[PDB]
Amino acid sequence: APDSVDYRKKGYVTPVKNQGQCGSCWAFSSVGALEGQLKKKTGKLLNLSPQNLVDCVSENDGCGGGYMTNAFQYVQKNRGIDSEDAYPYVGQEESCMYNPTGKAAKCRGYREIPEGNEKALKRAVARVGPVSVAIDASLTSFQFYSKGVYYDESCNSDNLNHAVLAVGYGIQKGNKHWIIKNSWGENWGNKGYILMARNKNNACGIANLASFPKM
Ligand SMILES: *[C@@](=O)([N][N]C(=O)[C]([C][C]([C])[C])[N]C(=O)O[C]C1=[C][C]=[C][C]=[C]1)C1=[C]SC([C]([C][C]([C])[C])[N]C(=O)O[C]C2=[C][C]=[C][C]=[C]2)=N1
Structure with missing residues (x-):
């Protein structure tokens, strides 16, 4: 890869x-x-x-x-999901109002990545595309991230509290990482992104709960 x-x-x-x-x-x-x-x-x-x-x-x-x-x-069971337009975000739970006319996609099941396996996670990103991952994002360092490849020894891999999206991977000045997309707005981290340490004993439980839809 x-x-x-x-x-x-x-x-x-x-x-x-x-x-x-x-x-x-x-x-x-x-x-x-x-x-x-x-x-x-x-x-x-x-x-x-x-x-x-x-x-x-x-x-x-x-x-x-x-x-x-x-x-x-x-x-998969619903056989679809509406487009943002046909079911806008309001940030509050309400009655299921799925409109079949607005269906923009569907999926035929999912696949999970071997828990704890970053090598498995990289190969998936390379040949599948973005992958949904769960991490520990409870640290003040994380909340206040701004530059470089994020890492913090206090980050617990067994406290998976925030689901995020892995849109890539690379290396910054001899520091391997995962390109992570967050949902805390464009004014958070680096344009709503964060580079997190890769191949560093499963930083924050990055590979503990990775999965992806199959189409
Ligand atoms: C996240 O939305 N909620 N956590 C989960 O869904 C977890 C972890 C992953 C998804 C597996 N799921 C889970 O535990 O499984 C089922 C379950 C549920 C409950 C108990 C037991 C089991 C999340 C992360 S951060 C966040 C907050 C909400 C809060 C009201 C403040 N959103 C937020 O901070 O956004 C706005 C923002 C913007 C800029 C800066 C700071 C904040 N919710």
Whole structure:
């Protein structure tokens, strides 16, 4: 696999979104994974509906947390997911209002990456596209990230509290990393992004819960 790849430069990633005061991290992370696959298979790049997921996946808790896999399976069974336009983001749980007329994509299941395996995670990013991952983002260092390849020895790999999206990987001054897309707005980190340490004993549980939709 390439020693470096940036899906943002491939046109696989939509603009940075902002979840606001709702624990919809999982939804945004799932939508991001679906978005990349939609781009790869059809060549079209549009914003999907995280709100569709927040309101409709009964296995997740909406603004109270959830898992990407549940969101993916929901999309398989539901046979689709609305476009951002047909189901805009409001940042609050409400009744499932899925509109079939607005369906912009669907998926046929998902695949999980071997837990703890970063090598497995890299190979997937290289040949599949962006991958939904869960990390520990509870540290003040993280919240205040701004430059360089992020790392903090206090980061717990067993405290997976924020689902994010892995849009690539590379190396910055002899420092391998993952190109991470966040949903805390464009004014957070580096344009809503963060470079996190790669191949450094699973920094923040980066490879503990990685998965991706299949189309
Ligand atoms: C995230 O939205 N919520 N966490 C989860 O969904 C977790 C982790 C991943 C997704 C697996 N899921 C989980 O635990 O599984 C099911 C479950 C749920 C509950 C209990 C047990 C099990 C998340 C991360 S950060 C965040 C906040 C919300 C908060 C109201 C403040 N959003 C936020 O900070 O956004 C705005 C913002 C913008 C700029 C700067 C700072 C903040 N929610």
